[PDB]
């Protein structure tokens, strides 16, 4: 077997989910934090197979703001009623920072993982595109903090939890290792998009050239690293 701690297995995210993630643009503005959708999937061969997602919207006029769960309830029935399921084993976001598991995402995750333990959180490398490694990140919450879950303490009572010394460099599972079995219709797109005409391949390849020559990519990443990281360093 290949399990971590507790009953939760490794995740896999089907390309059909990744395209439904990527249909949402980067363009909210400069940047604001929103949970962009829930991840729906089931325990199968080696993994939790995420089969599909529906995007979970929020108000985006300047700041973000919430709305009634009439969306999620009606939309999780909309996925059920074609053929029968509702299976929220995680959620995802594509916010500007890079990949970054903030204290609020840890609190939102703590409420999520204590309620349903067969779950993971997803982040994706945005149109920010530094792109060296790991375009998709998984992360589970440790069982050792979930055993002491209600809320944290604005007082020294946290010291009894701190002496468990639970992980904060904890393991992240490898999402993709083997074929998702629904590769097969998009495999049959490739010959039609490649063998007979130049019209449809080159527009996916042209992006790399201008990821090098265009304005200040690594320079702006190291500039934001000169701003994000020194603010965290000074704080500690």
């Amino acid at each position: 077997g290949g399990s971590g701690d507790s009953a939760v297995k490794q995740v896999q995210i089907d390309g059909l989910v990744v395209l439904k993630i990527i249909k949402h643009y980067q363009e909210e503005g400069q940047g604001t934090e929103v949970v962009q959708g829930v991840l729906l999937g089931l325990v199968v061969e080696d993994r939790l197979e995420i089969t599909n997602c529906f995007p979970f919207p929020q108000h985006t006029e300047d700041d973000a703001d919430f709305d009634e769960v009439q969306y999620q309830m009606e939309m999780m029935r909309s996925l059920r009623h074609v053929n029968i399921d509702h299976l929220h084993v995680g959620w995802y976001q594509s916010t500007y920072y890079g990949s970054f598991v903030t204290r609020a995402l840890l609190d939102s995750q703590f409420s999520y993982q204590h309620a349903i333990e067969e779950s993971v959180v997803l982040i994706y490398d945005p149109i920010k595109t530094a792109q060296g490694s790991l375009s998709l990140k998984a992360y589970r919450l440790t069982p050792k903090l979930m055993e002491v879950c209600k809320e944290k303490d604005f007082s020294p009572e946290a010291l009894k939890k701190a002496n468990i010394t639970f992980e904060h460099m904890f393991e992240e599972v490898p999402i993709v290792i083997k074929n998702s079995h629904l590769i097969n219709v998009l495999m049959w797109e490739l010959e039609k998009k490649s063998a007979v005409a130049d019209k449809h391949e080159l527009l996916s390849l042209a992006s790399s050239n201008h990821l090098g020559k265009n304005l200040q990519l690594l320079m702006d990443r190291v500039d934001e690293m000169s701003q994000d990281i020194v603010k965290y360093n000074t704080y500690m």
Partner: protein, 272 residues
């Protein structure tokens, strides 16, 4: 010139049709849904789509358009760019039963967009065949089947274009995402290697006796332009400036490891 002629489809339509056709939706080989997106006057700009409660049989059709109101209300909130456009189906293009789906869609006001995804093994089928009605006048028996065929131009909005190519590479060979820019590197010099194969064949066509009509001045323009891009022009001032830029980039890449080391050292003393 009168109207719609071409569809500008893209990957998430096909992914949502396949994620409706596989899995299941009551019908086995025959599955249906309402496509969403927008149009621009001769082109269709299909943006995303979702399936609907359905059952087609050799004497029956069920389009619960009330669910395509709910799903449309929901997907309007997801992004303003969608509109109820038409419908999509699997397996076959022409039947008498398909005239019923046009009546169910004629209960909405706009121009219809009938898409058939024809999942044959054969290369003689284009994967999705696109149609729209003509001679849509005033009521005869039900509705007409003299459809105008549509071409494809693909090429909708940006970020999705990398998403399908990552999946197409995965369809050829399954691989782990930590290597992706090293994979772009080692297929980089492979392009220069298969270029060394083709450039040989284009030289070799003049070497043997006669040929090379497939190349000459177009390949000459390609190669002159290629060396005017990569590398640049060839003074040694460029070599030293290239070296100073690598010594700066290396000093920056070094300083990123110096900051990893100090991200550690402050994280470490507070843990005592």
């Amino acid at each position: 010139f009168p109207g719609g002629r071409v569809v500008r489809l893209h990957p998430v339509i096909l992914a949502s049709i396949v994620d409706s056709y596989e899995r299941r939706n009551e019908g086995a080989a025959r599955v249906i849904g309402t496509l969403l997106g927008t149009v621009d006057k001769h082109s269709v700009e299909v943006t995303n789509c979702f399936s609907v409660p359905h059952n087609e049989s050799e004497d029956e059709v069920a389009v619960d358009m009330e669910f395509a109101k709910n799903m449309y209300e929901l997907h309007k909130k997801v992004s303003p760019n969608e509109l109820i456009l038409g419908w999509y189906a699997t397996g076959h293009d022409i039947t008498e039963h398909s005239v019923l789906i046009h009546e169910y869609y004629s209960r909405e006001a706009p121009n219809p967009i009938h898409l058939t995804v024809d999942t044959s093994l054969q290369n003689g089928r284009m994967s999705i065949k696109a149609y729209v009605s003509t001679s849509m006048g005033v009521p005869g028996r039900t509705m007409g089947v003299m459809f105008t065929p549509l071409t494809v131009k693909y090429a909708y909005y940006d970020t999705e274009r990398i998403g399908v190519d990552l999946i197409m590479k995965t369809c050829f060979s399954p691989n782990r995402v930590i290597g992706l820019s090293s994979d772009l590197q080692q297929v980089g010099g492979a392009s220069a290697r298969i270029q060394d194969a083709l450039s040989t064949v284009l030289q070799y066509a003049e070497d043997v006796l006669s040929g090379k009509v497939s190349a000459d001045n177009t390949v000459g323009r390609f190669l002159m332009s290629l060396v005017n891009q990569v590398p640049k022009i060839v003074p040694d001032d460029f070599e030293t400036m290239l070296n100073s830029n690598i010594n700066d980039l290396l000093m920056v890449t070094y300083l990123a490891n110096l900051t990893q080391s100090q991200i550690a050292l402050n994280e470490k003393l507070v843990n005592l």
